[PDB]
Each structure stands twice: as C-alpha cells, then as structure tokens.
Design an enzyme around this catalytic site. Structure first.
Site, PDB file in Angstrom:
ATOM      1  CG  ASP A 152      -2.157   1.027   1.058  1.00  0.00           C
ATOM      2  OD1 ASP A 152      -2.488   1.446  -0.090  1.00  0.00           O
ATOM      3  OD2 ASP A 152      -2.728   1.402   2.126  1.00  0.00           O
ATOM      4  CG  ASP A 179      -8.244 -12.857   5.850  1.00  0.00           C
ATOM      5  OD1 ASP A 179      -7.131 -12.599   5.324  1.00  0.00           O
ATOM      6  OD2 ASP A 179      -8.892 -13.901   5.611  1.00  0.00           O
TER       7      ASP A 179
END
Ligand code: 4W5
Length: 315
Positions: A152, A179
């Site tokens: 990122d 997740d």
C-alpha cells in the site's frame, strides 16, 4: 546494503528506551489531544499515554468481532516489536477495547505527504529525491528483516516529521486484520500497479509502481491519471472520471509521465523506470538504489526539515 549512521543508531536507541518504559496498553491509559483523521481502516487521533506522558498516534478500527478474531490479529501485530528501521514508523502496541482495535505508534508531527501536498501545491524535485531514498530504504528493509512487502504505497502512507525524518505506515503485517477488513474501509486501488488490478504476479514490483505514481502526483500537484491537456499544463507550470473507469484506464492505456523541461531528465528517467506496465521490465530496488537520480539525491545536502516546517507552518 542496509547500513546505519551514529545519529540514526542514537534515535533508534532512544525510541526503544522510551518504548520499554511503557508496559501493557489499556483504553483507560489514553487521553485524546486532537484528531489526525481517517485513515486506512478507521480514525487516527494524537493521544497521550497518561502513565508514561508519551505522545502517540492511536488507530481505532471499529470492528465488533468475537474475542477469537481480535486476539489472532494482536498476535500478528506483535511481529512489529522486532521492527527497527529509521525508515519505518515506530510501533508501541496493539489491543482490543469496547468495540475497536487500537494500534499505537510513533507520532509524526509533519503528518502525511497527502497533507503536505495540499499545503505546498507541488513538492520540489530535490525534496522528492530524499523521499525516494526513504521509500526505497524502507521497502528494502520490509523485504529483508520482515520478509513481507508493503502492499500500500501512497502519499497518505509516507509520514514525515520536524527532525526531517521520512517513514512508512499502514503496510500489511497482520493477514487476519486485512481478512476481517473485507467490509469495512477497503484502501484505494488507484495506486495499485496494472498487474495487481489483473490479479497476476505481484512482488515488490507493485510497490515500485505505487512509488513512481506517488512521485508523479507530488511533483505535478495532481493525481496523474488521466493525463491532463497542455491547457491544464499552462494553468499548472506555464511552459470527472469514476473509480472503475480510472482503474480500467490504468491497465489499458499508456503510463503517466512527468512534463518535459520543468523537471530534470534523471528524475523523468527514474519515474519512467518505476512506471513501466510490464513488471519484468520494471526496475527492481537494487537497480533503483543506484540510479543516477538516487546517487545525485544522496550526494545533495537537502534541508528537508527546513522546507517542511516553512511549508506546513510549524510553530
Ligand atoms: C495512515 C493512517 O495513519 C495516519 O493517518 C497517521 C497520521 C499521522 C501520524 N503520526 N504518527 C502516526 C500517524 C499516522
């Protein structure tokens, strides 16, 4: 190639000493100072850990999940305690409390480069040299001492401070945190390589694309895609597209480039090597770590803290 200096060893030593003085973290130990705003997950507040009197940043990721889920996340975030880089934001600890997952880290008074960008208009090339060195050294460390990629790289994740330091934040360390965050926030894909938006092979090569694009945006003072016309270049130097449409443009159309004449050729070459769509032809860290732009930038004694303080009006 990961070598330190005396001033960097001195600062890394002090942080560890400050950190060891802090014990287990608890909601009731934190006193809010201000808000540093959202936030790739939830909210971010500048807080004071009352017992130690330390100033930290606290990330609050509101997830009303079971005690099994949260404890596994904390276990993964504990890996960051081993993390010791002058190019990566400091970690204090993680914990759950009435609704949210709190992540406490080193405070950066300069904030993000997305914030520095809004104020400055456009960041000067000599400054982007120092930033480039820092992102490179950071990503190199993430691959070495932590065998994980950033996943990122964007202006919002490059954090700066008044001591002239540049460090990386909000990089995937906990697999289970991402997740459970499938709903929930979901980080912008506008900085992802045209191969990650295809699901195909993704290594430190996607981080390099992300860097090159962050660099283009900061240099011109606008998100590069779609390439503006020469009329917007007269407006800029003199010398409304939806997210799904934008991402389709990335994979399909030619990559963005810096405008000619305004910038130096070494720097245009540098970004060009980062924004090659094919990952195999795109430059790796070793190559970048010795590119003419980096060599020149390292050799220049750029007063980053000076520039910064003047730009964001520190105080
Ligand atoms: C990417 C999400 O983190 C932030 O927004 C942020 C902003 C300022 C900070 N200072 N120290 C740590 C910080 C983190």
């Amino acid at each position: 190639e990961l070598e330190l200096d005396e001033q960097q060893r001195k600062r890394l030593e002090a942080f560890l000493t400050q950190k060891q003085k802090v014990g287990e973290l608890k909601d009731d130990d934190f006193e809010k100072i201000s808000e540093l705003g959202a936030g790739n997950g939830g909210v971010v507040f500048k807080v004071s850990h009352k017992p130690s009197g330390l100033v930290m940043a606290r990330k609050l990721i509101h997830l009303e999940i079971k005690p099994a889920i949260r404890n596994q996340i904390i276990r993964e975030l504990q890996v960051l305690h081993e993390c010791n880089s002058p190019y990566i934001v400091g970690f204090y600890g993680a914990f759950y409390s009435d609704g949210e997952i709190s992540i406490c880290m080193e405070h950066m008074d300069g904030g993000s480069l997305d914030q520095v960008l809004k104020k400055a208009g456009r960041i000067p090339e000599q400054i982007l040299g120092k930033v480039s060195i820092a992102v490179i050294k950071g990503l190199t460390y993430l691959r070495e001492k932590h065998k994980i990629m950033h996943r990122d790289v964007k202006p919002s994740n490059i954090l700066v401070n008044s001591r002239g330091e540049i460090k990386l934040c909000d990089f995937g360390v906990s697999g289970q945190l991402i997740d459970s965050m499938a709903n929930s926030f979901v980080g912008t894909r506008s900085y992802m390589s045209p191969e990650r938006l295809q699901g195909t092979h993704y290594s430190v090569q996607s981080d390099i694309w992300s860097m090159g694009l962050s660099l283009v945006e900061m240099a011109v003072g606008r998100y590069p895609i779609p390439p503006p016309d020469a009329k917007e270049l007269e407006l800029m130097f003199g010398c409304p597209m939806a997210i799904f449409e934008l991402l389709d443009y990335i994979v399909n159309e030619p990559p963005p480039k810096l405008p000619s004449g305004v910038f130096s050729l070494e720097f245009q070459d540098f970004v060009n090597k980062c924004l090659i769509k094919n990952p195999a032809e795109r430059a790796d860290l070793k190559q970048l770590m010795v590119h003419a732009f980096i060599k020149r930038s390292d050799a220049e004694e750029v007063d980053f803290a000076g520039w910064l303080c003047s730009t964001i009006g520190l105080n």
